Amino acid sequence: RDMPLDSDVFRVPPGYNAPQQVHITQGDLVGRAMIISWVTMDEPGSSAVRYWSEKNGRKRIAKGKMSTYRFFNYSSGFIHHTTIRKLKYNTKYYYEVGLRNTTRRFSFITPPQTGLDVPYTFGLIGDLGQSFDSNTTLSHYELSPKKGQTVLFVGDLSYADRYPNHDNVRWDTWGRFTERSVAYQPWIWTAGNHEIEFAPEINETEPFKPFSYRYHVPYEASQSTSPFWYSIKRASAHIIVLSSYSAYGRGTPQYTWLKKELRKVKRSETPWLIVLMHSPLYNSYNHHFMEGEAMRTKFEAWFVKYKVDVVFAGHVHAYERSERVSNIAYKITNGLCTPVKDQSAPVYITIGDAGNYGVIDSNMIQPQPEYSAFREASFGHGMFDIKNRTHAHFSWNRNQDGVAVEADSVWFFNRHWYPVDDST
Amino acid sequence: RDMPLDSDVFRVPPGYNAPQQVHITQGDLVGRAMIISWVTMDEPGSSAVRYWSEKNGRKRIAKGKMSTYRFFNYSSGFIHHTTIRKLKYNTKYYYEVGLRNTTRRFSFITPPQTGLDVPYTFGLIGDLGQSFDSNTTLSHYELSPKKGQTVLFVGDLSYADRYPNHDNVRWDTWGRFTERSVAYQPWIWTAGNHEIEFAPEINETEPFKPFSYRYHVPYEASQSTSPFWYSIKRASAHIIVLSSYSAYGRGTPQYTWLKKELRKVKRSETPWLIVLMHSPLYNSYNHHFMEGEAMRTKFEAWFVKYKVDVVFAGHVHAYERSERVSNIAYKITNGLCTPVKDQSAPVYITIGDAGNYGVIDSNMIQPQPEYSAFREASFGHGMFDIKNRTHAHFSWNRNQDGVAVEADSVWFFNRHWYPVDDST
Ligand SMILES: *[C@@H]1O[C@H](CO)[C@@H](O)[C@H](O)[C@H]1NC(C)=O
Ligand SMILES: *[C@@H]1O[C@H](CO)[C@@H](O)[C@H](O)[C@H]1NC(C)=O
Ligand SMILES: *[C@@H]1O[C@H](CO)[C@@H](O)[C@H](O)[C@H]1NC(C)=O
Ligand SMILES: *[C@@H]1O[C@H](CO)[C@@H](O)[C@H](O)[C@H]1NC(C)=O
Ligand SMILES: *[C@@H]1O[C@H](CO)[C@@H](O)[C@H](O)[C@H]1NC(C)=O
Ligand SMILES: *[C@@H]1O[C@H](CO)[C@@H](O)[C@H](O)[C@H]1NC(C)=O
Ligand SMILES: *[C@H]1O[C@H](CO)[C@@H](O)[C@H](O)[C@H]1NC(C)=O
Ligand SMILES: *[C@H]1O[C@H](CO)[C@@H](O)[C@H](O)[C@H]1NC(C)=O
Ligand SMILES: [F-]
Ligand SMILES: [F-]
Ligand SMILES: [Fe+3]
Ligand SMILES: [Fe+3]
Ligand code: NA
Ligand code: NA
Ligand code: NA
Ligand code: NA
Ligand code: NA
Ligand code: NA
Ligand SMILES: [Zn+2]
Ligand SMILES: [Zn+2]
């Protein structure tokens, strides 16, 4: 089901050393920066990025860094990463890449300054891959009636690791394919199990190697010491990104960072507290059932204590929306091991149904558990539309439907500013 | 309670560039190799080690590597690691270090070839530290009527991380302190939370940095890609070392390694399957209560399926021995969350009461849970004395009793060669 190499979506842009696989993401904590990334295949080229606003058309230049890597018998092209800083809020900018030779121009609109009642619409995509279904999902995100301004990617990008020797060529195709979206609006990356790429058989033992080279994140901005876990603030949301396949035992770097980070969250500045992770803590599907238990025992109580609004995960190739529940009262022998309704707990949503390599997870645990509000084995994507400090409307759009149809939609009542029961 | 710097046990060996902090560990998979480690403070010196059999007085030389590191404003002396290989079984060997200038001689006895009924006695020490209690525990072990032939260290070594800026000098003192034992018999290293040393405040973001530089392990011998988890075979035991503070999520390096390692175990060759980890999966004490839950969800079922004989851990500053139980039938809503008797399960023992910095954990969950067979808050060490392929004798010696007293002692009946109920 994977799209052939000659497909139009994997078309290489014309012109000598023409920049390709162009993508961007927030480059600082508050939204005044952006990391611009792209690859050149003919030669190193320049890492300089020329930019300017639509209004204050003063053209400026930012220098970046170039790098390369090798996997098996695969050798990458020239990967460029450049950060544009001190940008003005809510203003459109134009940026050009490939100044040395063939130049290409794109644009993006910085988010508005963070604040209590700042509206913003987040796209939710997980386990995209590069199958025909992946193309449909992405198209639906773009043609969505509601204008998505940033994508929160829950993990599992290209699925190159399914090819022989993980044929990283499939990483480059994925970059050209998603360019039509990521180059114009930021995607906040989460690391999934397909990015680990631990392959001892072929002497490739550095976890997340290809992914980490191709996709950078502003982790130092939140005092994290690893790109696999970090935080950013955008508009009225505080987004926390975690790594399911990194150490999370007590005292470990990720564990320690998260504990301190939850303490720095200010619901007065960013009322919507969102958490991303690849593997779902709540999942009633057969596939990967209970794989989220470990991390759950570790962080669930914290999510409840700090009343996180939502937790988005992927991994399971389907869709699921839980009720607000918790299972934090277990003590080995007290028998309290059943999830109970907890209005202080976040809703857990799994949206790893963007397409992957074309397979869907339909085998579900039966009967549907009480903690599971809604579930369905269809390809699709989601949208978290923040209206204000009290309301956020989440909707799920299926690939079999019209780009404007919402097979499932719910209103989120902020755990901090609107303590009302938003159950369905 | 930590012993003062001028303590006799921290004395520095005389002579220019005299080798100090000498220690050894198995250097291969089966026991025909040994890693010799030591530090020189006055100058780099030579990494060559001269060794010879007590029988075959032929003196040979093994070349090694030297390294150094810095923590904060601390600069280490010169660290040497040299592996002596192709040794003969069950034979006494003499080795000398510091050949360049001041030389020091020591010895060790290679274990006998691996076999079904090969007897061997392993000492168990966890969370030693360097307080006076630490000195007492080490004394008892050296004076044990039953001589220990190899120590299985279950994590938390020097506790230097408790000093300002983790004053790494406390790593050097611990090195001299433990020498009187580790330089003659190998100690099998397990990494605990005090080795993590994650200190972002002073730009020390590399987990296990000091520990990984000072203590090496033959991790590649078992095809592991990290020194924090590995396996070795000694006599009639197959030992698996795990990292409580490394990633263990499905698909991670450690997770994958263990899954395959277990498949390579051969009970027809090494009948005793022993697992070491720092954080206990079963712990009825208040301190660190339920910290091992995450790893348990991940590996408990594997331990039961492969019928591990024993699992040793530390972390809790006390002693505990559990019944053979398993808590692997939980499915979120089926209500099966109570540990039950399971003869396929290993016994879980907490033995992190070697002394640490002089504090003991006496507060425990009341009443004592069914899964807990024996628990007591006293400083001490354990002894796992393997007799045959079918019998092994474990004993716990407290620091307040005579060196040959056994406050707790039980016979272990091999899960593969003598599966009889050994409850207490
Ligand atoms: C890597 O090896 C495969 C076959 O093992 C081969 O088809 C492929 O072309 C090699 N990669 C390159 C581009 O050298
Ligand atoms: C492409 O750009 C590089 C930038 O240094 C330059 O050296 C090279 O001459 C250019 N190629 C041509 C001749 O078009
Ligand atoms: C992918 O979808 C886009 C937009 O709908 C379309 O233009 C393109 O032809 C599709 N490519 C493939 C290979 O289906
Ligand atoms: C937030 O927006 C919703 C519209 O979706 C509206 O009904 C609600 O009254 C607003 N709440 C506040 C705090 O103004
Ligand atoms: C290291 O720095 C500390 C202050 O943080 C100071 O008290 C100590 O004397 C210094 N020691 C060394 C090794 O210079
Ligand atoms: C000490 O040994 C080193 C290592 O070979 C040598 O370079 C140096 O000259 C020696 N000095 C003394 C005091 O023996
Ligand atoms: C502890 O170690 C041995 C115990 O036999 C003894 O020789 C030594 O003096 C003691 N050291 C300290 C400082 O307690
Ligand atoms: C080993 O010794 C124990 C106790 O002496 C005995 O009960 C057991 O049967 C023996 N096992 C073998 C295989 O010799
Ligand atoms: F997946
Ligand atoms: F500890
Ligand atoms: Fe996936
Ligand atoms: Fe300890
Ligand atoms: Na799978
Ligand atoms: Na699977
Ligand atoms: Na998968
Ligand atoms: Na504590
Ligand atoms: Na503590
Ligand atoms: Na501790
Ligand atoms: Zn996944
Ligand atoms: Zn510990």
Residue numbers in the entry:
A (entry chain A), B (entry chain B): 9 to 432
Quote the paper:
Purple acid phosphatases belong to the family of binuclear metallohydrolases and are involved in a multitude of biological functions, ranging from bacterial killing and bone metabolism in animals to phosphate uptake in plants. Plant PAPs are 110 kDa homodimers, containing Fe(III)-Zn(II) or Fe(III)-Mn(II) centers, and a recombinant isoform from sweet potato has been shown to contain a di-iron center. The characteristic purple color is due to a charge transfer transition between a tyrosine side-chain and the Fe(III). In this study the structures of the rkbPAP-sulfate and rkbPAP-fluoride complexes were determined, providing insight into what we propose are two crucial steps in its catalytic mechanism, (i) the pre-catalytic stage, and (ii) the chemical step.
rkbPAP incubated with fluoride crystallized in a different space group and with different unit cell parameters compared to the sulfate complex. Two dimers in the asymmetric unit are observed yielding four copies of the active site. In these structures the metal ions are on average 3.5 Å apart, a distance significantly larger than that observed in any of the other rkbPAP structures. A small sphere of electron density is observed between the two metal ions, in a position similar, but not identical, to that of the μ-hydroxo in the rkbPAP-sulfate complex. The center of the bridging electron density in the rkbPAP-F structure is 2.5 Å and 2.1 Å from Fe(III) and Zn(II), respectively. Thus, the bridging ligand is shifted 0.2 Å closer to the Zn(II) and 0.4 Å further away from the Fe(III); its distance to the carbonyl oxygen of His323 is 3.6 Å, compared to 3.1 Å observed in the rkbPAP-SO4 structure. These differences indicate that fluoride rather than μ-hydroxide acts as the bridging ligand, as anticipated from kinetic and spectroscopic data collected for PAPs from pig, human and red kidney bean, and other binuclear metallohydrolases. Additional electron densities in the second coordination sphere, close to the fluoride, are tentatively assigned to a sodium ion and a sulfate ion (see Methods section). The sodium ion may offset the charge of the metal bridging fluoride group, and possibly prevents cations (i.e. sulfate, acetate) from binding to the second coordination sphere. However, for the M1 site in the fluoride bound structure the metal ion is shifted by up to 0.4 Å when compared to rkbPAP-SO4 and rkbPAP-PO4 which then results in compensatory rotations of the side chains of Tyr167 and His325. Here, the comparison between the sulfate- and fluoride-bound rkbPAP structures corroborates this mechanism for the activation of the bridging nucleophile.
